[PDB]
Design a protein around this ligand. Structure first.
Ligand SMILES: COc1cc(OC)c2c(=O)[nH]c(-c3cc(C)c(OCCO)c(C)c3)nc2c1
Length: 114
């Protein structure tokens, strides 16, 4: 393999599986598919959020070898969360859910050895 990079991408793949898993579903589910701005009525979503991201897209990119390394994977997970914080008011339910999921992500990702 390309060894350590490859190892760390496998580690990321496990983090992604965890984020998608039933144990986190109570707060992760808004992040399972792209934001459907039409259905939600967010007429300006794509005007404010230039680079949408969600866990299904992270999964697709992982599987398609589009990430060089764990840092690029993490950047997309963080982009997903940051888009949520960017678009929404701080008191919104989805922002709270994003934080709750982010603190799982950040703890798991931080445990990856350098
Ligand atoms: C169903 O999944 C989602 C995922 C989302 O982000 C990951 C969002 C999201 O970022 N904002 C909203 C959202 C929905 C409505 C109806 C809102 O009121 C618009 C009228 O004032 C606002 C402020 C946010 N819904 C999501 C749903």
């Amino acid at each position: 393999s390309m060894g350590k990079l490859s190892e760390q991408l496998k580690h990321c793949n496990g983090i992604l599986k965890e984020l998608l898993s039933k144990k986190h579903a109570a707060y992760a589910w808004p992040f399972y598919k792209p934001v459907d701005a039409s259905a939600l009525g967010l007429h300006d979503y794509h005007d404010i959020i230039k680079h949408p991201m969600d866990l299904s897209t992270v999964k697709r990119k992982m599987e398609n070898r589009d990430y060089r390394d764990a840092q690029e994977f993490a950047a997309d997970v963080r982009l997903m969360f940051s888009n949520c914080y960017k678009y929404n008011p701080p008191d919104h339910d989805v922002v709270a859910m994003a934080r709750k999921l982010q603190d799982v992500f950040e703890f798991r990702y931080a445990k990856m050895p350098d």
